[PDB]
Design a protein around this ligand. Structure first.
Ligand SMILES: *CCC(=O)N(C)CCOc1c(N)ncnc1-c1cc(F)cc(NC(=O)c2ccc(C3CC3)cc2F)c1C
Ligand code: NA
Length: 266
């Protein structure tokens, strides 16, 4: 009935880990509904800017998005209440079950993310930090996209600056690195890297390079190799995401149609 949640309705049960804004806890809303509670660390977020734009994020609704339930702002620290995902982040899930993953399950993961991204693209809403660490897995093995657009409110120069140690260089196209030009085509690039993370079973992209060496090699035309579990058709799809020219990259609508074609073929 309102996006402002009463913190007295929340029960804190277990710490889930730490994100870009600090501690995130698992809990219950009104003792029944499972929730993730982000406890926004002091000085980690542009809180006023986030609160002013929160309603747009609140209205984003799709089955493949980790839902934003509401906020607790009449306090300090503020809370962000989200959908809880029982299997945690995709990156750790891939690493934990690595040699038990089948190619059909890997394709299904790509499809789930692609559907979420096709929806964000239709809303002209940028994720800005799409990667396996920012995708979550529910109890049914469904992959959902998490923390879309939250990148904009980070107060941490190491993360927001392209020359910073926490900036997601390995998921960034050249126009983001050089010109800070974010678009649905920069999310396309990150999605290609994410497909590679899925098919490589959670390997770090360009592991033999530093962040600076990655940016340099990519600018010179180097691309991620075909993972062992990726077929020629799967590699063609992820590779199409890495066109040097943003306008020559496919849309998420085109990517989804290509993923469904591979699914129907196998
Ligand atoms: C990858 C490891 C892992 O499993 N983690 C971090 C736990 C996932 O836990 C979780 C669950 N199970 N459901 C919903 N939400 C979470 C969650 C927990 C956590 F500790 C951190 C986060 N992520 C963030 O808070 C986060 C990360 C990155 C960014 C970048 C600026 C965009 C923002 C942000 F809020 C989650 C989602
Ligand atoms: Na192979």
């Amino acid at each position: 009935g309102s996006w402002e949640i009463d913190p007295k309705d929340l029960t804190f049960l277990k710490e889930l880990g730490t994100g870009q804004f600090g501690v995130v806890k698992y809990g219950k809303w009104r003792g029944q509904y499972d929730v993730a509670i982000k406890m926004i660390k002091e000085g980690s977020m542009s809180e006023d800017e986030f609160i002013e734009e929160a309603k747009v994020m609140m209205n984003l609704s799709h089955e493949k998005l980790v839902q934003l339930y509401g906020v607790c702002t009449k306090q300090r620290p503020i809370f962000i209440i989200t959908e809880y995902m029982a299997n945690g982040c995709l990156l750790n899930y891939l690493r934990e079950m690595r040699h038990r993953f089948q190619t059909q399950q890997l394709l299904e993961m790509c499809k789930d993310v692609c559907e979420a991204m096709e929806y964000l693209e239709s809303k002209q809403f940028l994720h800005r930090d799409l990667a396996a660490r920012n995708c979550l897995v529910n109890d049914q093995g469904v992959v959902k996209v998490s923390d879309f657009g939250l990148s904009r409110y980070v107060l941490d120069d190491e993360y927001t600056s392209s020359v910073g140690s926490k900036f997601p260089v390995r998921w960034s196209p050249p126009e983001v690195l050089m010109y800070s030009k974010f678009s649905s085509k920069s999310d396309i690039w990150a999605f290609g890297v994410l497909m590679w993370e899925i098919y490589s079973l959670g390997k770090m992209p360009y592991e033999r390079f530093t962040n600076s060496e990655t940016a340099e090699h990519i600018a010179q035309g180097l691309r991620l190799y075909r993972p062992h579990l990726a077929s020629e058709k799967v590699y063609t799809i992820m590779y199409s995401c890495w066109h040097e020219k943003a306008d020559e990259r496919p849309t998420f609508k085109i990517l989804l149609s290509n993923i469904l074609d591979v699914m129907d073929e196998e």
